[PDB]
Structure 1
Amino acid sequence: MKIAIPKERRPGEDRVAISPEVVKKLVGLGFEVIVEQGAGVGASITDDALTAAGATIASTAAQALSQADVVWKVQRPMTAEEGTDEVALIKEGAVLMCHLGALTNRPVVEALTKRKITAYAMELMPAISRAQSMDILSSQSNLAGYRAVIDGAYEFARAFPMMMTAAGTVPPARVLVFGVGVAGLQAIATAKRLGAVVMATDVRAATKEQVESLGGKFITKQAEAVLKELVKTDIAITTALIPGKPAPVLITEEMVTKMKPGSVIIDLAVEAGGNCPLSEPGKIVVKHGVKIVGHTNVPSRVAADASPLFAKNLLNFLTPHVDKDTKTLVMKLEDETVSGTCVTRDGAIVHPAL
């Protein structure tokens, strides 16, 4: 077949849905790999590194997509009503695989449906063991947890680790991670790596284990223990998200009141409403001496690492549906990773969203 990966046109999107390693896997499966010129610049992947891997370079997005049987993209295709009709570049009846944001972006679903594109919403990857290697949310939110701490330390005018010194004892920074997670668990680990005293909370019971496994202090009706820790906290990282519904409010404005000056909040759910009210998307707000960070698209801040993984999730999702040197792709419907993520098909939105 013919497979195409365009550059991401949306503002601030530096990731790309491919890497040189995954190119070599695709050609080996019997694919022609098309990649738009400069798509991997934000992810530190040269066009040279892709040609060397076996891929073909297209000058424009349209060209790359024109003859593409299968299309790999990071974020949803932009419609005509958004200034760049990317949907019109995909060949009719072609397959689409990307982070569609299907449930919160229905006009894009119709646009694709109207072109008879069979689009797979990668974000709905069912919660099973074999499909975690296909899971884009974990893979990417994992980097977000890491980056959430690197952003913490960058805005923090104190040091993370404890340090006994001729000039006195530099105390260890105190981190409180809201919502254990792929993201949350990765925040915990990176913070502890830096030398901070990490604490953590979440509504899920079995949390304690993985938190304590990392050597983090799981907080143990129960809410009053956080307010007692949050006041001692230097870096507060919140990661709690809800599918479709807005983000939970774990840190209110009066909570910020009780925090030390020079004390940071990384609200990773900023885009989904935020876990902190005064956290604003794409900004660093200074409130009550507390810096409230609400960066948009955090996985894009680790583009060079975020991209190659994202590409493997797709590779993992696709591979078992290739025949044996038959040079054909066919997504076995009865497979639940296919069934659960197919949002639209053959000109009809064949999914629970009437």
Structure 2
Amino acid sequence: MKIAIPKERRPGEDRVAISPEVVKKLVGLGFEVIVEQGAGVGASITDDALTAAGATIASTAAQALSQADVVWKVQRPMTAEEGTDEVALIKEGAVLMCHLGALTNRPVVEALTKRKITAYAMELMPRISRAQSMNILSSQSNLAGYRAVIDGAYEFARAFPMMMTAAGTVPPARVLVFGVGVAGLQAIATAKRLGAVVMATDVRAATKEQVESLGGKFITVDEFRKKQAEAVLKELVKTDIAITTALIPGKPAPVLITEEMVTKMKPGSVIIDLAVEAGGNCPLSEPGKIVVKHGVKIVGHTNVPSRVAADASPLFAKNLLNFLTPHVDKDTKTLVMKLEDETVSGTCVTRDGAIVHPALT
């Protein structure tokens, strides 16, 4: 079979759904691997590095996808309604694996269904231990958590660590991480290793132990418990960098720092709002912008995993590889996807010209 990987066409997307290591593994499984010219450039992967690994290079996207039985992408393909019909480039009856956003983008799901394309939405990977290696949500959001700290340190006008000098002593930065999922934990780790005093808060109670296991301090209080909002504010007033990561799928992001809260922060402070694409944990944040209000920088970059595209791409490619590998026969050149497999049934949104996933039928 032929597997194809195009360049990502959406603005600002520098990731690619391939790496030289994964090319090597795919050829070993009996695939012909085709990559579009310049697809890995944003991810620091040259055409020469992929040819060396065993891949063929196609000069255009249409040529890459023309005869491909399997297609791997990072973001969902663009539709004719978006002005560039990428789904039409994909061969009829073929298999697509990518981050679809299927539960919030039914038009692309319908457009793939018209071409009888079998689409697997990688974001719908079930939360089971054996599928951890296939989870794109965790691999990408982990780097986003690291990157939040780097972006925060860049926008901050003081150094992170304490420094004892002959000229005098400058204090460490104080960091407050809102939301302690995968992204929040890596932000705690990165802020901490850089020398900052790190606080964290999360609504879940099992989080306290996880925060402490990284040397962070969890915000605690000791009927109507809004002494919690009081305990958070007490720390937020001393905070130099606030990183907010709280995300609810399908829904707007919860408001964790109001404008009233921002006004009480000191000048030179910086908020990194990683929920900005879903409305933001702070109302003042704007997608793709750094806003300055009340002396505070409100940083709202889009596609934060793409700001670490060269480390993000090999992990994304490995997630797909791990998902696809158990279904390659190689006694006949066929990809037989197994229906009783929970990763297959969990991620399949449409196949053979019919919508399959229960949430979209």
Structure 1 window deviating more from structure 2 (38-47 vs 167-176): it is: 167-176
Match of 2:246 in 1: 240
Superposed displacement of residue 330, structure 1: 1.0
Superposed CA deviations along residues 175-222 of structure 1, whole A, max 9, x for unmatched, are: 000000110000000000100000101111111222111111111153
Superposed displacement of residue 234, structure 1: 0.3
Q: State the superposition RMSD in angstroms.
A: 0.9
Superposed displacement of residue 316, structure 1: 0.6
CA distance in 1, matches of 2:359, 2:204: 29
> What number of residue pairs does the alignment pair up?
354
Superposed CA deviations along residues 57-84 of structure 1, whole A, max 9, x for unmatched, are: 0010011101000000000000011121
CA distance in 2, matches of 1:183, 1:327: 39
Q: Check the 8 A contact 1:17/1:307 in 2, yes or no.
A: yes
CA distance in 1, matches of 2:331, 2:148: 43
CA distance in 2, matches of 1:352, 1:259: 46
Q: Check the 8 A contact 1:30/1:325 in 2, yes or no.
A: no
3-state DSSP of counterpart to 1:102: coil
Q: Check the 8 A contact 1:162/1:171 in 2, yes or no.
A: yes
Q: Check the 8 A contact 1:35/1:57 in 2, yes or no.
A: yes
Does residue 225 of the first structure (1) align with residue 231 of the second (2)?
Answer: yes
Superposed displacement of residue 165, structure 1: 1.2
CA distance in 2, matches of 1:57, 1:325: 27
CA distance in 2, matches of 1:272, 1:145: 16
CA distance in 2, matches of 1:222, 1:290: 23
3-state DSSP of counterpart to 2:198: strand
Q: Check the 8 A contact 2:327/2:337 in 1, yes or no.
A: yes
TM-score by length of 2: 0.97
Q: Check the 8 A contact 1:6/1:73 in 2, yes or no.
A: yes
Q: Check the 8 A contact 2:6/2:36 in 1, yes or no.
A: yes
CA distance in 1, matches of 2:262, 2:9: 36
3-state DSSP of counterpart to 1:166: coil
TM-score by length of 1: 0.99
CA distance in 2, matches of 1:325, 1:165: 68
Superposed displacement of residue 223, structure 1: 2.7
Q: Check the 8 A contact 1:20/1:50 in 2, yes or no.
A: yes
Q: Check the 8 A contact 2:123/2:136 in 1, yes or no.
A: yes
Superposed displacement of residue 103, structure 1: 1.1
Identity of aligned residues (%): 99
Superposed displacement of residue 353, structure 1: 2.9
CA distance in 1, matches of 2:255, 2:270: 17
3-state DSSP of counterpart to 1:344: strand
CA distance in 2, matches of 1:185, 1:24: 33
3-state DSSP of counterpart to 2:98: strand
Q: Check the 8 A contact 2:329/2:335 in 1, yes or no.
A: yes
Superposed displacement of residue 279, structure 1: 0.3
Q: Check the 8 A contact 1:75/1:100 in 2, yes or no.
A: yes
Q: Check the 8 A contact 2:30/2:330 in 1, yes or no.
A: no
Q: Check the 8 A contact 1:29/1:327 in 2, yes or no.
A: no
Structure 1 window deviating more from structure 2 (13-22 vs 317-326): it is: 317-326
Superposed CA deviations along residues 106-164 of structure 1, whole A, max 9, x for unmatched, are: 11110001111110110111111111110101100000000000000000001100111
CA distance in 1, matches of 2:206, 2:138: 18
Q: Check the 8 A contact 2:136/2:316 in 1, yes or no.
A: yes
Superposed displacement of residue 325, structure 1: 4.2
Structure 1 gaps of 5+ residues are none
